[PDB]
Enzyme design. Sequence first.
Site, PDB file in Angstrom:
ATOM      1  N   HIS A  43     -19.582  22.411 -16.327  1.00  0.00           N
ATOM      2  CA  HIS A  43     -20.948  22.847 -16.585  1.00  0.00           C
ATOM      3  C   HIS A  43     -21.046  24.357 -16.453  1.00  0.00           C
ATOM      4  O   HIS A  43     -20.175  25.028 -15.889  1.00  0.00           O
ATOM      5  CB  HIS A  43     -21.969  22.102 -15.688  1.00  0.00           C
ATOM      6  CG  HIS A  43     -22.074  22.628 -14.285  1.00  0.00           C
ATOM      7  ND1 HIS A  43     -23.282  22.773 -13.640  1.00  0.00           N
ATOM      8  CD2 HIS A  43     -21.123  23.029 -13.405  1.00  0.00           C
ATOM      9  CE1 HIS A  43     -23.073  23.238 -12.420  1.00  0.00           C
ATOM     10  NE2 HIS A  43     -21.773  23.402 -12.253  1.00  0.00           N
ATOM     11  N   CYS A  97     -22.792  28.678 -10.809  1.00  0.00           N
ATOM     12  CA  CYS A  97     -22.126  27.750  -9.915  1.00  0.00           C
ATOM     13  C   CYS A  97     -20.761  28.311  -9.535  1.00  0.00           C
ATOM     14  O   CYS A  97     -20.114  28.995 -10.325  1.00  0.00           O
ATOM     15  CB  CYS A  97     -21.970  26.381 -10.580  1.00  0.00           C
ATOM     16  SG  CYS A  97     -21.181  25.162  -9.537  1.00  0.00           S
ATOM     17  N   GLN A 115     -26.910  15.321  -8.827  1.00  0.00           N
ATOM     18  CA  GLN A 115     -28.350  15.250  -9.013  1.00  0.00           C
ATOM     19  C   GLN A 115     -28.640  14.365 -10.210  1.00  0.00           C
ATOM     20  O   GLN A 115     -27.914  14.394 -11.207  1.00  0.00           O
ATOM     21  CB  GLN A 115     -28.937  16.643  -9.195  1.00  0.00           C
ATOM     22  CG  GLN A 115     -28.722  17.491  -7.959  1.00  0.00           C
ATOM     23  CD  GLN A 115     -28.880  18.963  -8.237  1.00  0.00           C
ATOM     24  OE1 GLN A 115     -29.866  19.580  -7.815  1.00  0.00           O
ATOM     25  NE2 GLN A 115     -27.934  19.532  -8.991  1.00  0.00           N
ATOM     26  N   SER A 138     -31.077  22.688  -9.110  1.00  0.00           N
ATOM     27  CA  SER A 138     -30.210  23.857  -9.009  1.00  0.00           C
ATOM     28  C   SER A 138     -30.552  24.905 -10.045  1.00  0.00           C
ATOM     29  O   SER A 138     -30.326  26.095  -9.810  1.00  0.00           O
ATOM     30  CB  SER A 138     -28.728  23.483  -9.154  1.00  0.00           C
ATOM     31  OG  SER A 138     -28.428  22.317  -8.422  1.00  0.00           O
ATOM     32  N   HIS A 141     -28.579  23.550 -16.727  1.00  0.00           N
ATOM     33  CA  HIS A 141     -27.164  23.268 -16.944  1.00  0.00           C
ATOM     34  C   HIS A 141     -26.866  23.075 -18.426  1.00  0.00           C
ATOM     35  O   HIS A 141     -27.663  22.478 -19.156  1.00  0.00           O
ATOM     36  CB  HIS A 141     -26.722  21.989 -16.196  1.00  0.00           C
ATOM     37  CG  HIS A 141     -27.059  21.947 -14.736  1.00  0.00           C
ATOM     38  ND1 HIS A 141     -26.158  22.319 -13.756  1.00  0.00           N
ATOM     39  CD2 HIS A 141     -28.202  21.610 -14.089  1.00  0.00           C
ATOM     40  CE1 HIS A 141     -26.716  22.159 -12.566  1.00  0.00           C
ATOM     41  NE2 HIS A 141     -27.958  21.746 -12.741  1.00  0.00           N
TER      42      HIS A 141
END
EC number: 5.2.1.8
Length: 147
Positions: A43, A97, A115, A138, A141
């Site tokens: 990702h 990330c 998630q 977060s 993505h």
Amino acid sequence: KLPPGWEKAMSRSSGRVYYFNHITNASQWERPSGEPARVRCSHLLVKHSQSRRPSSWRQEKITRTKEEALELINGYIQKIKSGEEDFESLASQFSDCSSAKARGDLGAFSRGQMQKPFEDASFALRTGEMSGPVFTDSGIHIILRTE
Ligand SMILES: CN1CCN(c2ccccc2CO)CC1
Ligand SMILES: CN1CCN(c2ccccc2CO)CC1
């Protein structure tokens, strides 16, 4: 009719039918082709000021808005789809990330570990498919299912 999450849609600008997946936010002109215990995904994450942790290896304080994060995601998707850039290259350079250091690879995982929106998109992707923008706490993505 169509694989999980896919629906037909109408292009506003061209009038041509296309296919949209409401789980992965993928969209494509071509009729979609079509679950395992585990999938492997990479990702590219773009965080924003409302992310659970608005901090990353790229920026100590992430101040961009969610709308600005989405425009960045959209631009990365355009460059990946045009072939101008590879997913792995963009993830290594621009993912918020820490998995950026592994070309975005998260390794393999089961349901119940990630998630939920990320998990749902990951498992609705066919091997080799890429998502559209997927929203979690977060950030936003781009998900590439690799296995
Ligand atoms: C300590 N920090 C760096 C190392 N951590 C890591 C790295 C690779 C695989 C899995 C993990 C943790 O799930 C993330 C947190
Ligand atoms: C929650 N995740 C923990 C493990 N992740 C990571 C980080 C560095 C290298 C490789 C990986 C995983 O393949 C970061 C995000």
